[PDB]
């Protein structure tokens, strides 16, 4: 068993490695940097960037070993500007920034309301209401254009849609972000979320001591974005708490996640408020970017779009209109979501700190090492996916249960996988059902759209769609 130091590497000087990364590839192209590194070093390597050293893997077979050796309270890589902000400005932390027993207590309480089938069934009509209103926005814009047609960049509208959805399931109340005249303070919350992510990038790979010294402007902007996030989330939670006491009525109808947690959970109010903040912020940029990519791949692959429409129409008929029943009759659509995340992951990597020593590819990796799975590079790798550039949803329906082995990694894995996974899957599946029933989607002057790293991975340039009523 080969020692750690023999794992291929650019070298042990983290600051020099950072220098070469910035010069040759650039901060906003870390995903390409991973691709290039596997081509240079093979299927496993180590790289110290600034202060942080990691081992990087790409093989699903190595991924399987990593996750099998996982302990009861897994830890991923913590974003240092996020940590520094919460510590310095003394903001209560939620499940994202907690560890061990304190993380477990939050997670178990939250899973009961946001992950469990018994809870999630209640999300359906709340998410369906928002998606139906999105459809109406588009029909209205089509009428106004006068051409039987609507063309536009809808990224801003997708951010608003994602915000309506997450707020509706949390608060059981519509915020009005899909109306013609919008709440400017809710729009300020949406913009801050984007800014928090974008401003995170120049501070990555640096200790907090170096942030304020060499990234002072960025840090200041980053602090301001988090302050907006916390101000507004706290106001929402505070108002809800008091209005609940003003209306003091037991409800038989479902009122949302916050009502459930305030009404009956082991969580303190302060843990609840901290987690509400993280759920709201997690709810905005991820599902909206993923949906945008999905529409892009449907416009790029019109045969696949047709197949998906036909399955949705059959499912609506078969279910006699019931959404709950429909969602079990659209396997190809759910596959196309897996396929969208394969090509366009939100998260460049998954990461785990090892609890015990571990052997990967005949190399000994000591306990406490950070191991990263390169999700983006895996998805483009022709040895792990047949024709990786092809958008092919049936790939996930293959009875060859080897082709999909540890491939579906967009939401992570295990007990500390994405907390919003069910919300996101349901929101996106329900959105696409309504869209496919109502419109055909095209891109005029279609061209390949690249990816940029803004903490989350994002389209590198605007995408302008054309929608035809179907």
């Amino acid at each position: 068993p080969r020692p750690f130091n023999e794992i291929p590497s650019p070298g042990d000087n983290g600051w020099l490695n950072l220098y070469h990364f910035w010069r040759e590839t650039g901060t906003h192209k870390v995903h390409l940097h991973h691709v290039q590194n596997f081509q240079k070093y093979g299927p496993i390597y180590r790289e110290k960037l600034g202060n942080v050293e990691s081992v990087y893997v790409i093989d699903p077979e190595d991924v399987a070993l990593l996750f099998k050796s996982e302990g009861p309270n897994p830890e991923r890589f913590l974003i240092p500007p996020w940590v520094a902000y919460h510590q310095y400005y003394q903001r209560p932390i939620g499940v994202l920034l907690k560890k061990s027993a304190a993380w477990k207590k939050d997670r178990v309480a939250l899973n009961q309301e946001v992950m469990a089938p018994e809870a999630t069934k209640n999300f359906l009509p709340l998410l369906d209401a928002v998606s139906r209103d999105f459809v109406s926005v588009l029909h209205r814009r089509i009428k106004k254009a006068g051409s039987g047609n609507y063309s536009g960049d809808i990224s801003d509208d997708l951010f608003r849609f994602a915000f309506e959805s997450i707020t509706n399931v949390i608060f059981g109340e519509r915020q009005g972000m899909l109306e013609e005249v919008v709440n400017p303070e809710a729009q300020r919350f949406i913009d801050a979320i984007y800014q928090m992510f974008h401003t995170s990038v120049p501070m990555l790979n640096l200790p907090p001591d170096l942030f304020r010294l060499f990234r002072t402007k960025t840090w200041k902007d980053h602090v301001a974005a988090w302050d907006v996030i916390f101000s507004k989330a706290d106001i929402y939670t505070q108002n809800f708490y008091w209005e609940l006491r003003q209306k003091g009525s037991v409800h038989h109808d479902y009122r949302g996640i916050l009502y459930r947690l305030l009404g009956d959970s082991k969580m303190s109010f302060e843990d609840i408020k901290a987690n509400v903040t993280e759920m709201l912020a997690g709810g905005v940029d991820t599902t909206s970017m993923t949906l945008q990519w999905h529409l892009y791949e449907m416009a790029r692959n019109l045969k696949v779009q047709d197949m998906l429409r036909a399955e949705v129409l059959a499912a609506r008929h078969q279910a006699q209109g019931d959404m709950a029943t429909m969602l079990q009759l659209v396997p190809l659509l759910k596959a196309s979501i897996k396929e969208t995340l394969r090509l366009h992951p939100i998260s460049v990597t998954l990461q785990r700190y090892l609890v015990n020593d571990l052997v990967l590819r005949d190399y000994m990796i000591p306990a406490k090492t950070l191991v990263q799975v390169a999700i983006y590079a895996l998805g483009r790798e022709p040895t792990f996916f047949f024709d990786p550039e092809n958008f092919d949803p049936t790939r996930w329906l293959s009875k060859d249960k080897n082709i999909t082995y540890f491939r579906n990694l967009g939401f992570g894995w295990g007990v500390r996988q994405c907390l919003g996974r069910r919300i996101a899957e349901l929101e996106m599946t329900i959105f696409l059902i309504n869209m496919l029933e109502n419109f055909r989607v095209e891109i005029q002057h279609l061209s390949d759209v690249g990816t940029t790293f803004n903490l989350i991975l994002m389209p590198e340039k605007p995408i302008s769609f054309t929608f035809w009523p179907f």
């Binding site: 992950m115 469990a116 089938p117 396997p331 999909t404 082995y405 491939r407 007990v415 069910r422």
Partner: peptide, 27 residues
């Protein structure tokens, strides 16, 4: 059963269930 019966892991291995299985469930 680490996630404790909420379909949020796969430690109880004895569409959503199908995906947890690729990476029957006891809960």
């Amino acid at each position: 059963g680490a996630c404790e019966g909420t379909l949020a892991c796969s430690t109880c291995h004895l569409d959503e269930e199908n995906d947890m299985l690729d990476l029957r469930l006891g809960c």
